[PDB]
């Protein structure tokens, strides 16, 4: 059964992929090769062309992503050759360095050996390669609450955070055959961070806010033609609202709106004053200003939705069905000011794609 | 078949309604009476108790409405006795007067005779009882574009608008047996309007914006126990974002954000400045300020979502399933600042309920 699933997924993927690459005449022979390989080994190996186009198709098919206009320019790094934890560490360090590109962010994915029979070869524990620790004791929170459980697991492995609000978590991953993950501190020279200041309000620096430059999602499974790449970290650049309307604003994250209200000089006393809305706008202006001033890539939500509109037009022109998740594509501020809010999207799942998988901790 | 549908819908409604009213022992005899009445007449007549509770249940079941906490205090006016167009006009004038209540808005529904065999007795053409006309010629728009088609139809019936940006449309409705609807100008003494000013920015009055006090939806069908009340206008009060983030802001409505930007003294040149977001916040603060200053009821979106949270808790406490449409319940500004954004809702349709119906014009 598992073997039949693989072959059916393989057939669909190779046909579509080779059609897109103008290789339709080669499908028959490639599918023959594959069936034999599956018959003998219980699996098959993608060509570098298949793996690269597959990762790009997976991005193109991600219903929740507003940044898909740029799917075809994804930089795919093939690391299916790694066998040791030093090689994984160095590959993850390299990804950070080349994706960061001195601030001019390059969308990149590094692809590690895939699952064999559901057995992982490399298991990454981080949610993002660069993220801040979170702590709770004594009732008072320090850092990013979304990182509380992983931070606690790292402190079970001999690591200790300084307990600032912005401790960088170490890389943490497990190799097939090892019982415990290993961890490595991130070299600070690799990690660009951006201090948050406001273009007009000098007091805004009093909040001492910062965020990291490059979001690199490292806990999703890339599925391509029935092959499960559970370890394939990827990055784009931030849309500013992710930082300003969610990471720094959510009550269960950094919860900064009352402090923002205070430094911008407005009362935070009455719902009818819309002080939360006003604070959210100024915090989001500060995030965009600060990234731009630092020379780190970022996109505002209006420009992002305009880009997504072009992606919709591109799909229609290419004769491709468009899929999307309206509830995630709308930005969390001024959503009715974007075209997204005023149309609907088919939320069907199409493969290749990126999928959630169970956490190894918790 | 139609008759079977009616009986099945009647059974479900009477059982549930009488259960809620502590009248469970009367269900059997009432259902007997009903089946006979259906058998003889092809229909049945609600008691005043059934009609009143039915309208309230219909509101409670409206998935898209954030204001449902107050469903049980709906003021139901029974006008199933009307037979003439003068009686309909006077009933609609009365609804406006008693719902408006000098600014302290009372949620109210007036219920007219229902469809008989799909044949309407009274057919209301207005989308809302109080709404502004819209015109397009010469390329330039005047008034509310959402009213363009109905305004054109009214001008086919001998009415003529002054072509200001805020012309009040007349009431327009058709009686069973008449080929054309009749129209009646609204007495201005019945219509409260609110000029839009800003609490801190004096220049805001230069925009000369206003909106009407009471939104009274008059084109939906109330369905209760298989009976179709196609004419049953209802009103609550506004949530401020409806006016400030949509009616005055949408590009296909009054499209005022660039003018707002100008009077609040910010540039409207760069997406990264978030000038649309800032303009939206100040316009929405002005709307809430102006309604409050005029003594007209209105709710801000933060308070409304807090009320909706209580509605969710009330349902769970009463053992009632909650249904909702996430895509409409989230407010169009700062939606992630409300609890609504962070949970999900079952969008199942439950009756009694309010439904769209085909327009008689267009
Ligand atoms: C180039 C810049 C990019 C931008 C501005 C962008 C923007 C976004 C945003 C704003 C989200 C919503 C995230 C959230 O609210 O937590 C998102 C989701 C997503 N993006 Fe993109 N994205 C970009 C590139 C990429 C790349 C390169 C990939 C993969 C190759 C990717 C795959 C996804 C996926 C899978 C999700 C869904 C995550 C989930 O369900 O939790 N995106 N994107
Ligand atoms: C008491 C104050 C009320 C408030 C603040 C309120 C709030 C709202 C809001 C903001 C919407 C979304 C409208 C839009 O975006 O166009 C809505 C939808 C709705 N409300 Fe309420 N509402 C209230 C009372 C009522 C009443 C009294 C009824 C009926 C008896 C009602 C039935 C509905 C229905 C049917 C919709 C959906 C309209 C559609 O699908 O187009 N509401 N409500
Ligand atoms: N653990 C799960 N999933 C899960 C649980 C909680 C949260 C999440 C994801 O949380 C998101 C909340 N906003 C955060 O996602 C971060 C993200 C994802 C994609 C793009 C993001 N932003 C960017 N611009 C980019 C990052 C990388 C490329 S572009 C950020 C996932 C599971 C569910 C079922 C089985 S496992
Ligand atoms: N014509 C249709 N429906 C339709 C078409 C276009 C638009 C609409 C409704 O437009 C809404 C856009 N936001 C406007 O609804 C106005 C509204 C509805 C409910 C509550 C509203 N606000 C309030 N606070 C209240 C008004 C009355 C009680 S509370 C406003 C409905 C049909 C579809 C299928 C068959 S007919
Ligand atoms: C396509 C989309 O569902 C549509 O534009 C909806 C979105 N959510 C909404 N929500 C409310 N409250 N009112 C609306 O008119 C809309 N428009
Ligand atoms: C319940 C709801 O679907 C959930 O909170 C979603 C809403 N839309 C979202 N949209 C984005 N882009 N990111 C998110 O984390 C969420 N959260
Ligand atoms: Cl993030
Ligand atoms: Cl309205």
Q: Is residue B178 part of a domain?
A: yes
Q: How far apart are the C-alpha atoms of B13 and B26, rounded to whole Å?
A: 13
A246 lies in the same domain as A317: no
Same domain (yes/no): A284, A313: no
Task: Spell out the residues 6+ positions from residue A353 whose beta carbon is closer than 8 angstroms to its own.
Answer: A58, A61, A62, A222, A223
Q: Residue A12: is it exposed, middle or buried by C-beta count within 10 angstroms (0-12/13-18/19+)?
A: middle
Task: Tell if the CB–CB gap between A332 and B334 is shorter than 8 Å.
Answer: yes
Which residues in A lie closer than 8 A to residue B335 (C-beta atoms)?
Answer: 330, 332, 335
Q: Quick check: B276 contacting A, CB < 8 Å?
A: yes
User: What method did the depositors use to determine the structure?
Assistant: X-ray
Q: CB-based contact (8 Å) between A20 and chain B?
A: no
Question: Based on the domain organization, do A140 and A102 belong to the same domain?
Answer: yes
**Beta carbons of B281 and A285 less than 8 Å apart:** no
The length of chain A, given as a count of residues: 362
CB–CB of B44/B36 below 8 Å? no
Pocket probe for ligand 5: among B128, B245, B327, the residue whose CB has the most ligand atoms within 8 Å is: B327
| Dihedral pair phi/psi, residue A245, rounded to 5° | -105, -10
B243 plus B148 within the same structural domain: no
Protein residue with its CA nearest to atom 12 in ligand 1:
A65
DSSP 8-state assignment for residue A351: S
Residue B278 sits in a domain whose CATH number is 3.90.1230.10
CB-closest option in B274, B302, B333 to A285: B274
Answer yes or no: is B344 within a domain. no
- Residues in CB range of B67: below 8 A, 6 or more apart: B236, B239, B299, B304, B307, B308
Identify which of A192, A190, A172 has the alpha carbon closest to the alpha carbon of residue A182.
A172
CB B126 within 8 A of CB B169: yes
End-to-end Cα separation, chain A, in angstroms: 31
Compute the distance from residue A352 Cα to the ligand 6 centre, in Å.
22
Query: What number of other Cβ atoms are within 10 A of residue A10's Cβ?
Result: 24
Torsion, Cα B113 B117 B122 B125, to 10 degrees, reads 130
* A157 and A55 within one domain: no
* Residue A269 token pair: 């006393």
| CA atoms within 13 Å, Cβ hemisphere of A83 | 1
Catalytic-residue membership of A242 = yes
Placement of tokens 């935070």 in the chain: A268
Could you give the CA distance from residue B112 to residue B78 in angstroms, rounded to a whole number?
7
Q: Which of A285, A294, A276 minimizes the C-alpha distance to A201?
A: A285
Alpha helices by DSSP H, chain B: 2-20, 27-41, 48-60, 85-100, 148-154, 240-241, 257-263, 275-294, 301-318, 326-329
Q: Quick one: A281 and A165 in the same domain? A: no
Measured at the CA of A296, the angle between CA A293 and CA A297, to 5 degrees, comes to 115
Q: Are residues A228 and A207 in the same domain?
A: no
As given in the structure block, the two tokens for residue B268 are: 């409207």
Do B258 and B167 fall within a single domain? no
The answer to whether residue A154 sits within a structural domain is: yes
CA atoms within 13 A on the CB side of B155: 15
Q: Which of B332, B321, B323, B124 is nearest to B234 (CA)?
A: B124
Furthest-apart CA atoms within chain B: distance in Å: 71
| CB environment A254-270: b (16+ within 10 A), e (fewer) | bebbebbbebbeeeeee
**Maximum Cα–Cα distance across chain A:** 71
What resolution in angstroms does the PDB record give? 1.9
Q: Please list, in sequence order, all residues whose beta carbon lies within 8 angstroms of the beta carbon of residue B47, skipping any fewer than 6 positions away.
A: none
Catalytic residues of B: 65, 68, 237, 242
Half-sphere exposure for A249 (CA within 13 Å, toward CB)? 28
CA–CA separation, A36 vs B88, rounded Å?
Answer: 79
**Number of domains into which chain A is organized:** 3
**Shortest CA distance to A240 belongs to which of B267, B274, B337?**
B274
Asked if B136 and B199 sit in the same domain, the reply is no
Q: Is residue B92 part of a domain?
A: yes
CB contact under 8 A, A281 and B281: yes
Ligand 3 proximity of A59 Cβ (cutoff 6 Å): no
- In total, chain B counts a number of residues equal to 362
Catalytic-labelled residue, pool A20, A97, A116, A242: A242
Nearest to B224 by CA among B48, B351, B45, B321: B351
Q: Establish if B336 belongs to a structural domain.
A: no
Report how far residue A233's alpha carbon sits from residue A219's, in angstroms, rounded to the nearest whole number: 7
Asked whether residue A337 is assigned to any structural domain, the reply reads no
CATH code for the domain in which residue B97 is found: 3.90.440.10
Q: How far apart are the first and last CA of chain B?
A: 31
Active site residue A237: yes
Query: Contact at 8 Å (CB) between A10 and A38?
Result: yes
Q: Do B249 and A337 touch (CB under 8 A)?
A: yes
What is the rounded CA–CA span in Å between residue A170 and residue A85?
14
Q: Which of B333, B329, B238 shows the shortest CA–CA distance to A276?
A: B333
Cβ-Cβ contacts under 8 Å between A and B: the total is: 90
Q: Domain of B319?
A: 1-80+107-117+221-235+305-329
Inter-CA distances, B117 with A255, B41, B219, B262, Å: 58, 11, 19, 56
Cα dihedral sign for A36, A37, A42, A48?
Answer: negative
Residue by residue, what is the 3-state secondary structure of B109-163? EEECCCCCCCCCCEEECCCECCCECEEECCCCEEECHHHHHHHHHHCCCCCCCCC
Instruction: Indicate whether A348 belongs to any domain.
Output: no
Rounded Cα distance between B18 and A122, Å, is 62
Q: Which CATH number covers residue A314? A: 3.90.340.10
Q: Are A6 and A39 in contact (CB under 8 A)?
A: no
Segment (H or E) for A306: helix A301-318
Asked whether residue A86 falls in the same domain as residue A127, the answer is: yes
Same domain, residue pair A187 and A197: no
CA–CA separation, A341 vs A333, rounded Å?
11
Token pair recorded at residue A92: 């993850």
Q: Which of B172, B221, B171 is nearest to B357 (CA)?
A: B221
Q: Nearest CA to CA, how far is B341 from chain A (Å)?
A: 9
**All residues at 6 or more sequence positions from B109 whose CB lies less than 8 Å from its CB, including other chains:** B55, B74, B75, B76, B77, B222, B232, B233, B234, B235
Cβ-contact B105, B297 below 8 angstroms: yes
Whole-angstrom Cα distance, residue B362 to residue B360?
A: 7
Residue A356 Cβ < 6 Å to ligand 3: yes
Who contacts B144 (Cβ-Cβ below 8 Å, separation ≥6)? B131, B132, B133, B134, B247, B253, B254
Strands (DSSP E) along B157-229, which ranges? Answer: 171-175, 182-184, 193-195, 210-212, 216-217, 221-224, 227-229
In a domain, B187, yes or no: yes
Q: For B89, phi and psi rounded to 5 degrees? A: -55, -50
Same domain, B197 and B262: yes
């Amino acid at each position: 059964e598992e073997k039949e699933i693989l072959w059916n997924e393989a057939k669909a993927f190779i046909a579509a992929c080779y059609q897109e690459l103008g290789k339709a005449a080669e499908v028959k022979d490639r599918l023959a090769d594959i069936k034999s390989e599956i018959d003998l080994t219980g699996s098959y190996v993608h060509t570098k062309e298949e793996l690269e186009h597959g990762a790009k198709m997976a991005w193109r098919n991600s219903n929740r992503c507003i940044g898909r206009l740029f799917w075809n320019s994804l930089n795919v790094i093939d690391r299916r050759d790694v066998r040791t934890k030093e090689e994984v560490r160095d590959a993850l360090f390299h990804h950070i360095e080349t994706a960061t590109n001195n601030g001019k962010i390059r969308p990149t994915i590094t692809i590690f050996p895939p699952e064999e029979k559901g057995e992982k070869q490399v298991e990454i524990w981080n949610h993002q390669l660069i993220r801040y620790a979170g702590y709770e004791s004594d009732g008072e929170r320090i850092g990013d609450p979304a990182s509380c459980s992983l931070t606690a697991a790292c402190e079970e492995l001999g690591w200790r955070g300084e307990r600032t609000d912005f401790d960088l978590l170490p890389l943490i991953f497990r190799m097939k055959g090892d019982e415990q993950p290993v961890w490595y501190e991130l070299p600070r020279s690799l990690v660009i961070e951006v201090p948050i200041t406001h273009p007009d309000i000098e007091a805004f620096s009093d909040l001492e806010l910062k965020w990291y430059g490059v979001p690199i999602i490292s806990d999703m499974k890339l599925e391509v033609g029935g092959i499960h790449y559970n370890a394939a970290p990827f990055n784009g650049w931030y849309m500013g609202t992710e930082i300003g309307a969610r990471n720094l604003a959510d009550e269960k994250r950094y919860d900064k709106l009352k402090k923002v209200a205070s430094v911008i000089g407005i009362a935070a006393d009455y719902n009818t004053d819309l002080w939360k809305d006003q604070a959210l706008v100024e915090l989001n202006k500060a995030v965009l200003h600060s990234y731009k001033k630092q020379g780190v890539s970022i996109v505002d939500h209006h420009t992002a939705a305009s880009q997504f509109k072009r992606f919709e037009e591109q799909a229609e022109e290419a004769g491709r069905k468009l899929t999307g998740d309206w509830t995630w594509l709308i930005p969390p501020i001024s959503p009715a000011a974007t075209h997204i809010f005023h149309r609907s999207y088919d939320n069907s799942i199409v493969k290749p794609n990126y999928f959630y998988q169970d956490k190894p901790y918790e």
